[PDB]
Every structure is written in C-alpha cells, then in structure tokens.
RNA sequence: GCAGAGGUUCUAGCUACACCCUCUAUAAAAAACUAAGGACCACACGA
C-alpha cells in the first residue's frame, strides 16, 4: 500500500556550541559553558592562548 | 571595517561625591574588559595626586 | 484516490517552492533551513 | 609623562615581527601592552576568504574526480590561505589549474591589487591526467570571526566560514629601557604573529587608533 | 458574527481554536487571509 518512497539526506554541520558535551579519555566530562573570545584566554610568556 | 560601536553614556548613578558608578551600554565584545582594566590600572597605579 | 508527488501544493508561497524542482523534489545540493520544504506531497481532498 | 614611539620594528620573519615601544613608566608598560594585545586579537581587519564556487561541484560535501581530497578539505585549506588586498573591499579570485600537481595559491589569477602573501599554501592536489579544477574564490575584508551560519543564493555556491583575523599570537614583554639618563623606564616589545596579510607597524597603529577612539566616549580631543 | 448562504481570490470558507461584511430565504461594490489526527514492547545511551 505505498506508491513511492523518497529519501532525502540532509548534511548538518553542527559546530561546537555552549552546552555541547565534551569529555576526555579519563572520565572527565563537562558541558561547554561559554565560547570565550581568544583575547580573554590565559596566555603564557610565549603568548599562545590555552 | 574600521567602524566601531562607540559607547554612549546611558545612566551614571551619582552616589555621594566620594563615590560614583559610571557605566556604558553599547561598547564592543571583549572591549569592556580592555577598557575596564586599562582605566583601573591607569588611574590606580599612576595619577598626579598629593598625599 | 492516491496522493501525488508533484510540485502543486496549495496555500504555499513561491519562495518555498523555489528550492524544489519542477517535479516537486528538492534540488540536490540546495542549502535548506529549518521549517523549509523538501519534497512536495499533497493528499487528495 | 612619556610618549611611546616606534623606536624599532624587528621583522624577524616574513610572518611575525617584533615591534618595540621605548618610553613607558610604572604600570603603563603592562597596561598598554595588554590593551594593545586585546585590541589586536579582538578586532583586526583581515581579508579572509568567505565564499567559494567550484566549476562543477554542486555542494560542500560532494567530490569531483581527479582531486586528491574532498571539497570540504579544499574549502578548509582555502580558509587557511593568507591574502591581502589594497584598493577593493571586495575581490573575486579565479583559480584555474590543470594536470597532475598540487594546486598551490601561486597559480591564482590575481588582479592588480590583490596578492597572495603565501604562494606555497597548498589547496588541493590534482591526480588524473585530464583533471582540471576551476574555482571562483570570493575574498572580502572584515573584522573578527563570523561563521557562515550567521550571515545574511544559487545551489552551486559554497560558503566557507570567515576568518578575518590577520593576527594569531600576540605576546608582549615589558623590560627596562636604555635611555640616556633616567630610571623607572620600561620598553614594550610585542611579538605579534600574523599570517602575512598585515604590516606589524600599521597593525599596531590601527589597534592604537581603535583604543584611542574608544576612549573618546567621554573625553574630547 | 454563533442556526444557513453569498462576496472580490483558489474546490470549499457558515467563528471549526480559527480572519472581514450582509439578512432571515435574496447573492455582489471590496484589499490583508485558510486546514482542526497519530499507541505498546524491546534495545542502546545520558544524568
């Protein structure tokens, strides 16, 4: 009882967002709270922000 | 590209003359911290005063 | 009667049907958004 | 007080230089260095690519024969190229390559004003003998980072996330100066890292203009 | 505008949660508009 079936494949590019569940390999899991601008990041003497 | 959202004073609550609370609404992203820290250091570590 | 897959959908704008092809199926590679229409199917009344 | 000046600009490498400001006193050094670093990293006018059209690629996720990698990796490599323009705020770059060989940025049919500062930046590798890729790269100036999902037509147009940020690593050091006769004077050296699209002198000067104009909200000239 | 029909559109539009005007047995001068269905068992996963 069907005529024809149309399958449409949608590719979603989900960027990292506040709330996305990010977790390391050692059981440390956390939700991203804020996407802090790079100028606000702690930088070492070399200037590379973490 | 050089245009920026220059802040405009919106309400400066004038507490007694020994205290004040100045605020700016528009400004820019990350510029609030820059201006706040710059002003804080610039007037907290080097100002012409008598004591 | 059955339902057709053509692009003739009532009470919709031409902007929504712009993405769909002449036969009522979204063009491959089209960048659709939330709430958009992909394939036009109208039930018989 | 004392006025910092462009005492030296040590262009140590093609990408990153070492600018020096000489006259500064207690606080000024760190304050001015941090303010300049934040202004540079926050809002510096870059000219990153923002829109790409391929000759025969329908969408971002398809693949044309003869190319080493996906079109998505091609777009991400395109985002990485450093390009600077002089006159036009908007410019369209046409890339036409044929035959086996990596498609570096050097083969871009540049206009009079637009020029690639890193011609060695590889975009894609052509593999088949009769493999040709023809892309129309749309490059426009801008400030900050704006993704393709938060902006504003044909199905064949591909959107690449904009990365208008010439600077990538700004490090400043505050150390004592070598003035003729004085103490408590420090020199600020900024180890700014750029992709090559901005001159360090004009970058510092523009950041300082932005900072000074932001201070004019309640202070007259 | 609460019981029905008609109107300029687009089959049909009478408040159906629902959008304009008319009257109680007669159909048109008139632009913004339209739809009211939908369970259980298993699996895996998160806190």
From Swiss-Prot, chain A:
It comes from the Bacteria. Acetylated on several lysine residues in the presence of glucose. Signal peptide: none annotated. Co-administration of salinamide and rifampicin or salinamide and myxopyronin suppresses the emergence of resistance to both antibiotics. Belongs to the RNA polymerase beta chain family. DNA-dependent RNA polymerase (RNAP) catalyzes the transcription of DNA into RNA using the four ribonucleoside triphosphates as substrates. The RNAP catalytic core consists of 2 alpha, 1 beta, 1 beta' and 1 omega subunit. When a sigma factor is associated with the core the holoenzyme is formed, which can initiate transcription. The rRNA transcription and antitermination complex (rrnTAC) consists of RNAP, NusA, NusB, NusE (rpsJ), NusG, SubB, ribosomal protein S4, DNA and precursor rRNA; S4 is more flexible than other subunits. In pull-down experiments interacts with CedA. (Microbial infection) Interacts (via flap domain) with Escherichia phage lambda antitermination protein Q; this interaction renders bacterial RNAP resistant to transcription pausing and allows it to read through termination signals. This is DNA-directed RNA polymerase subunit beta. The chain holds residues 1045 to 1094 of 1342 of the full protein.
From Swiss-Prot, chain C:
Co-administration of salinamide and rifampicin or salinamide and myxopyronin suppresses the emergence of resistance to both antibiotics. It comes from the Bacteria. Acetylated on several lysine residues in the presence of glucose. The RNAP catalytic core consists of 2 alpha, 1 beta, 1 beta' and 1 omega subunit. When a sigma factor is associated with the core the holoenzyme is formed, which can initiate transcription. The rRNA transcription and antitermination complex (rrnTAC) consists of RNAP, NusA, NusB, NusE (rpsJ), NusG, SubB, ribosomal protein S4, DNA and precursor rRNA; S4 is more flexible than other subunits. In pull-down experiments interacts with CedA. (Microbial infection) Interacts (via flap domain) with Escherichia phage lambda antitermination protein Q; this interaction renders bacterial RNAP resistant to transcription pausing and allows it to read through termination signals. DNA-dependent RNA polymerase (RNAP) catalyzes the transcription of DNA into RNA using the four ribonucleoside triphosphates as substrates. Belongs to the RNA polymerase beta chain family. This is DNA-directed RNA polymerase subunit beta. It comes from Escherichia coli (strain K12). The gene is rpoB.
UniProtKB/Swiss-Prot annotation, chain D:
GO terms for biological process: DNA-templated transcription. One of its GO terms (molecular function) is protein dimerization activity. It catalyses: RNA(n) + a ribonucleoside 5'-triphosphate = RNA(n+1) + diphosphate. Residues 1-221 are annotated as: Alpha N-terminal domain (alpha-NTD). The keyword Membrane does not apply. Keywords: DNA-directed RNA polymerase, Nucleotidyltransferase, Transcription, Transferase. Transmembrane segments: none annotated. One of its GO terms (cellular component) is cytoplasm. Its EC number is 2.7.7.6. Belongs to the RNA polymerase alpha chain family. DNA-dependent RNA polymerase catalyzes the transcription of DNA into RNA using the four ribonucleoside triphosphates as substrates. Homodimer. The RNAP catalytic core consists of 2 alpha, 1 beta, 1 beta' and 1 omega subunit. When a sigma factor is associated with the core the holoenzyme is formed, which can initiate transcription. The N-terminal domain is essential for RNAP assembly and basal transcription, whereas the C-terminal domain is involved in interaction with transcriptional regulators and with upstream promoter elements. This is DNA-directed RNA polymerase subunit alpha. It comes from Escherichia coli O1:K1 / APEC. The chain holds residues 8 to 234 of 329 of the full protein.
């Amino acid at each position: 009882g069907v005529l024809k079936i149309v399958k449409v494949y949608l590719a979603v590019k989900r960027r990292i967002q506040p709330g996305d569940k990010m977790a390391g390999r050692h059981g440390n899991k956390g939700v991203i709270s804020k996407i802090n601008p790079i100028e606000d990041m702690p930088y070492d003497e070399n200037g590379t922000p973490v | 590209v050089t245009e920026f959202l220059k802040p405009r004073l919106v309400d400066i609550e004038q507490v007694s003359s020994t205290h004040a609370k100045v605020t700016l609404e528009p400004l820019e992203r990350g510029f609030g911290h820059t201006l706040g820290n710059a002003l804080r250091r610039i007037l907290l570590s080097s100002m012409p005063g008598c004591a | 009667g059955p339902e057709e897959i053509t692009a003739d959908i009532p009470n919709v704008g031409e902007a929504a049907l712009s993405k769909l092809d002449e036969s009522g199926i979204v063009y491959i590679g089209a960048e659709v958004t939330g709430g958009d229409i992909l394939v036009g199917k109208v039930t018989p009344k | 007080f004392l006025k910092p000046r462009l005492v030296d600009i040590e262009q140590v490498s093609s990408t990153h230089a070492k600018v020096t400001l000489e006259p500064l006193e207690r606080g000024f050094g760190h304050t001015l260095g941090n303010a300049l670093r934040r202004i540079l990293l926050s809002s510096m006018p870059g000219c990153a690519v923002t829109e790409v059209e391929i000759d025969g690629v329908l969408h971002e996720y398809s693949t044309k024969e003869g190319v080493q990698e996906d079109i998505l990796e091609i777009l991400l490599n395109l985002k990485g190229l450093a390009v600077r323009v002089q006159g036009k705020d908007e410019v369209i770059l046409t890339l036409n390559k044929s035959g086996i060989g990596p498609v570096t940025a050097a083969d871009i049919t540049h206009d009079g004003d637009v020029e690639i500062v890193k011609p060695q930046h590889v975009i894609c590798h052509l593999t088949d003998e009769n493999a040709s890729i023809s892309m129309r790269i749309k490059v426009q100036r801008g400030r900050g980072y704006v993704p393709a999902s938060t902006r504003i037509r044909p199905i064949g147009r591909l959107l690449v996330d904009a990365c208008y940020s010439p600077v990538e690593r700004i490090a400043y050091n505050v150390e004592a100066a070598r003035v003729e006769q004085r103490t408590d004077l420090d020199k600020l050296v900024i180890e700014m890292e750029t992709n090559g699209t901005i001159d360090p002198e004009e970058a510092i000067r523009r950041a300082a203009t932005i900072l000074a104009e932001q201070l004019e909200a309640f202070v007259d000239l």
